[PDB]
Amino acid sequence: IIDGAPCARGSHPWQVALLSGNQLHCGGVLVNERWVLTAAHCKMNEYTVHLGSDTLGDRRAQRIKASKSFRHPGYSTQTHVNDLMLVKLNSQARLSSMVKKVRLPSRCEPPGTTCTVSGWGTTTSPDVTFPSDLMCVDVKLISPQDCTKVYKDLLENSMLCAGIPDSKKNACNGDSGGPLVCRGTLQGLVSWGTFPCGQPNDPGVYTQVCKFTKWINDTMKKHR
C-alpha cells in the first residue's frame, strides 16, 4: 500500500496473507472456514495462509496450509481479466474475534463511494519496503467511463477502478487479492495498477466482486 497508515487494530479479521513458505506472496480474504478468495495472478501449487493478526510475521498467528486452488475459468494470464481465485484450506480455519468471514456483496456500490483497501505489500516503489503491520488507504470508486480515459483497452467489464485525485494512495506489489471494502461489503480484490506504483491519477484496478458472487458460491458448493 502506497501512502497509507496502519489499519485499525482488529478491524480486518477477514484479511489473510498467502505465503510461499513464510514469505509474502499476496493478500486474500477469508470467505468461510475452508475458503480464501484472492487474485488468480497469485496462483501457486501450494500456499501457507496467515490469519488472525494485523502483524504479518506474528509468531502467534494462525497458519494453515492450502494445497488446492481454482482460478476463474475466464482468467487471462495476458490481460488479467477475471483476476480471481478460490483457495481451499487443508483444514478448517478457527474463527474468533480476530478471524472472521468477510461480508460478500449483494449489490455493486456506485462511482464516488469511499472504500478502504488493505495489505502488506510494499509501501514504496520501485524500491521496495515491506511493512510488518497491515496498511490501509481510503480510495474512491471511479466510473468505467472515467477509468477508460486512462486505461483504454486494458480495462475490461468486471474490473473496478479506485483512487484519489492527484494522489499516490494506492495498492502495490504484494497487495493483490486483498480487500477493497465499501459501506460494509467486499467490493473489490486488488488486481493491478501501473508501475512504479503510486502514480497520481493512475487508478488502482480491482476485480469487481459484485459480478462474481454466483461463481464464488457455485465453486465452493462444487468442491465440498
Q: Which residues bind ligand K7J (CB under 6 A)?
A: 26, 39, 41-42, 80, 121, 154, 171-176, 190, 192-195, 197, 204
80 in catalytic set: no
Catalytic residue among 158, 176, 191, 202: 176
Query: Quick one: cell of 218?
Result: 457455485
- The DSSP symbol for 170 reads B
Q: Output the smallest distance, CB 118 to ligand K7J, in A.
A: 13
- Of 71 and 80, the one with the shorter C-beta distance to ligand K7J is 80
Write down how long the chain is: 224
Query: Quick one: cell of 101?
Result: 468471514
Nearest residue to ligand K7J, using CB? Answer: 176
176 in catalytic set: yes
Catalytic residue among 83, 118, 175, 191: 83
- Of 34 and 80, the one with the shorter C-beta distance to ligand K7J is 80
- Of 34 and 49, the one with the shorter C-beta distance to ligand K7J is 49
With b for 16 or more beta-carbon neighbours within 10 A and e for fewer, the 156-180 pattern comes to: bebbbbbbbeeebbbbbbbbbbbbb
C-alpha to C-alpha distance for 106 and 81, rounded to whole angstroms: 21
Q: 134: exposed, middle or buried (C-beta count within 10 Å: 0-12, 13-18, 19+)?
A: buried
165 prior amide bond cis, ω within 30: no
- Of 25 and 34, the one with the shorter C-beta distance to ligand K7J is 25
11 in catalytic set: no
Q: Which residues are catalytic?
A: 41, 83, 176
